[PDB]
Amino acid sequence: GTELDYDTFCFYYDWYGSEAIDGQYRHWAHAIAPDPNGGSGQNPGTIPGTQESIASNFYPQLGRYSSSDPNILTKHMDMFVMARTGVLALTWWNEQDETEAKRIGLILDAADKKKIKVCFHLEPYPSRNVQNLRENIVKLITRYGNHPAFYRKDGKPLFFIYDSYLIEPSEWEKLLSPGGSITIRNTAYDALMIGLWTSSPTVQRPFILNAHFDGFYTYFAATGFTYGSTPTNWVSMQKWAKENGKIFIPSVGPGYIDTRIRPWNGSVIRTRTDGQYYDAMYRKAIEAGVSAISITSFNQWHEGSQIEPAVPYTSSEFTYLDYENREPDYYLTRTAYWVGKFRESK
Ligand SMILES: CO[C@H]1O[C@H](CO)[C@@H](O)[C@H](O)[C@@H]1O[C@H]1O[C@H](CO)[C@@H](O)[C@H](O)[C@@H]1O[C@H]1O[C@H](CO)[C@@H](O)[C@H](O[C@H]2O[C@H](CO)[C@@H](O)[C@H](O)[C@@H]2O)[C@@H]1O
After folding, report:
1. How does it sit in the membrane (predicted)?
2. Does domain 1-346 bear CATH number 2.60.40.420?
3. Residue 2 class from Cβ within 10 Å (0-12 exposed, 13-18 middle, 19+ buried)?
4. Nearest in space to 214 (alpha carbons), one of 170, 139, 149, 161
5. Helix (H), strand (E) counts: the chain
6. Which residues line ligand 1 at a C-beta cut-off of 6 Å?
7. C-alpha to C-alpha distance for 215 and 238, rounded to whole angstroms
């Protein structure tokens, strides 16, 4: 009851910087988003990423850390071990820069020391399309496929494709149908491709089938934000997946709040209630009978979905939220509890 689960995927963000490593507190400093339904000439400003004012409603136990600090990465991997989460699902933005390449290598190396695996979460990078996706899948498999920490399920890499609906099924078919013009099927670069189920079944069922995804996930930590992130739909989504040979990987999270960076987005807040929100969502995933679960998130601090330890903090600029009345590592240990319950059902 302590071993890592390799059907549990925790969404991980590698975009943080520190003075120690990067020379800048990247992402801890963040622009504030204008209200999309507000007026013109909004000047919302920026969170400066100082000790006192960071781009989160919570405050990390590890402080304003760098994602490129090997000592932080060690600690993160120990946290994954505590949580029993065997797969780190790494955000990937196609930055095409030496710092990205360095960081990915460091993350893989750190993960392997703890027998954690790494897969990629392919984000909506500029001009993303099925041809450059193929090229990037080839690149990532070529670069990292022989690293011992690179994840495979029954011999195949796995990719989560965020906002897959931004690409038409007629394009996806070219990449993902066995007869597709630029198919990866039956090639050295074949992979499990997990698309994002957002809206109602009348839209999503034909999308997933016609695009030839291997499965689907839901991402959002906030219950009811989409049809897919409404857990009362999960039993029927799983039934459909099973009938159609698809892998359903529902996403569970401990809460949501992003109002430091999106002050206008308060309707999406989901309160943690000392763990009860996380418990309800994880229980529903398990009860749906799925074979894999994803966790939003390890460390999306901007969106308040993180399970990474947070500490009480009041500064002159902001009174942060915290996990009280639970301890800083509560969400790691509660994840381990749920991983056990999930395994009991597998
Ligand atoms: C209305 O758009 C949201 O909801 C749609 C579904 O109805 C999604 O398809 C769409 O992508 C939008 O969801 C993202 O944005 C909202 C805010 O509008 C967040 O609440 C969501 O959680 C989601 O964004 C997060 O997850 C994405 C996957 O990892 C990631 O791409 C996002 O990154 C963006 O926001 C962060 C700030 O939190 C910013 O630093 C990044 O540069 C990027 O702009 C985010 O993690």
Report:
1. Single-pass type II membrane protein
2. no
3. exposed
4. 161
5. 8, 11
6. 91, 123, 162-163, 198, 220, 226, 261, 268, 300, 302-303
7. 10
